[PDB]
Structure formats: C-alpha cells, structure tokens
Amino acid sequence: KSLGRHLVAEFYECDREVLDNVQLIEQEMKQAAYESGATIVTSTFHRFLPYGVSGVVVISEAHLTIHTWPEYGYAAIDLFTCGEDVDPWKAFEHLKKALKAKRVHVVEHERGRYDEI
Amino acid sequence: KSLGRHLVAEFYECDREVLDNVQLIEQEMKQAAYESGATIVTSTFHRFLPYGVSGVVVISEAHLTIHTWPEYGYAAIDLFTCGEDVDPWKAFEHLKKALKAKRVHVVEHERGRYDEI
C-alpha cells in the first residue's frame, strides 16, 4: 500500500523522571526499534539543561524520534518505519510501557502511497 | 496554542538526481533549517543503496527529516519545529525549490497542544 508507515504520537501523563533521563530514553528507544524489527543506522540523544530529552534513532529508510517535556509529563514521539517486516506499533507498545503514558493520541500516515507514486 | 508545529510532507516528481545526491541533500536540509530560523544541534545523513538518501537535522527540541526514493522521484519530509520564532513553512519553501517537486501534499500537526498538556 505504501513505502512506509508513520505514527505521529502524543504521550500524556508520562513518568517525568523517565522523560528527564537521557540514558534511559536512548535505551528504551533502541529497544523499541528492536521490537519493531527495524535495523538501526545511527542513534543520537541529548539533554540540554534548559530542556528535556531529544533523540533520534535513524533506521533503514526511516526514523524513530522523541522530544520530551518532563515539566508537562509530555512526549512528542514519531515512529516512521519502512518495510512490511517492520511494525511501528511494536515500538509504540514498548515506549508506551517504558514511559508509563496514561493517555495517548496517535495518527497513522501512509508515507509514499503506491497510488500516489 | 501548542509546543510545536509539525509538517508531514509528501514530495512527488522531484529531481531524481538531487534525491540521490547525499551531499546536496545535506546542504539543502541544513540551509532549510537556517531559513526557518531554527538552531541546529546536530545532523546525520546517510545514502541508501542502490538509491536513496536519509537524513535528520536535530534542532532545538525538534527535528527536520528526509527520506528519498530517487527511483520514484518521491521524498518523505518532516518539518517539526518549536517556538514562535521558528517557522517550518520556510524550510518547506526552500526544500520544495531545492528538490523541484512538481506535486506536494502537506499535513500540519500541532504537537503538544496547551489544552492537552
């Protein structure tokens, strides 16, 4: 149907200690990419004091990104995967559990629809 | 009304040679980040084989990403920016021009709505 599947997710009421832990966030993001069966290309995570954590796990022709706002218990997550063998929802599940999100809103986009290309 | 603005764009019928030029793509992506008013934290580009370029420019609490499919003249672009000072539509303009897309579809998402946070 499409080259890739992309989940644009809003995570609310997360564990704020976790959202402010850059080493833990990177760990859980890499674990999520593994759960989805994705192949990791590179991974870069950082936390600059005035903010929360930001990071990206670049995968084959796609990416998993996260930007956290500990002060609001909120996280902006994007799970973009390519290939019928890579499931964005597996990454979503692991992350939802790891961040202890109590409320989520997710929009799923078909990136590169075959009838559009 | 929200922490950030997010453009999910589909670029069709792009200059396939540009889509497969990893150095040029990197230049236009960082330049697009400049024109939008964002602050680049880091960036990482990789070329997919036999064809394709992947890249992510991490900015303050956000990101700009691109995944190209030269064999289809298609590129999946994401322009997520935070702050009233950064406008994702400027990056879009620069990229539309750089890739010479002849048809584009863009969805704008509000990431982290204040009324939800």
Residue type for A50, please?
P
Residue of A58, A62, A78 with shortest CB distance to B44:
A58
Task: Report CA-CA distances (Å) from B54 to A42, A68, B76, B98, B111.
Answer: 11, 24, 10, 16, 23
**Structural domain count of chain A:** 1
Q: Check CB contact under 8 Å for A116 and B12.
A: yes
First to last CA, chain A: 11
Q: Which of B30, B9, B2 is nearest to A6 (CA)?
A: B9
Q: Which of B104, B74, B54 is nearest to B14 (CA)?
A: B74
Distance from CA of B12 to the nearest CA of A (A): 7
DSSP single-letter state for residue A52: -
Tokens, residue B7 = 């453009």
Secondary structure in 3-state letters for chain B = CEEEEEEEEEEECCCHHHHCCHHHHHHHHHHHHHHCCCCEEEEEEEECCCCCEEEEEEECCEEEEEEEEHHHCEEEEEEEEECCCCCHHHHHHHHHHHHCCCEEEEEEEEEEECCCC
What dihedral do alpha carbons B93, B109, A26, A13 form, nearest 10°? Answer: 160
The domain that holds B60 is classified in CATH as 3.60.90.10
Look at A58 and B76 and tell me if their CB atoms are within 8 Å.
Answer: no
The H or E element spanning position A59 is strand A53-59
Residues of the domain holding A53 = 1-117
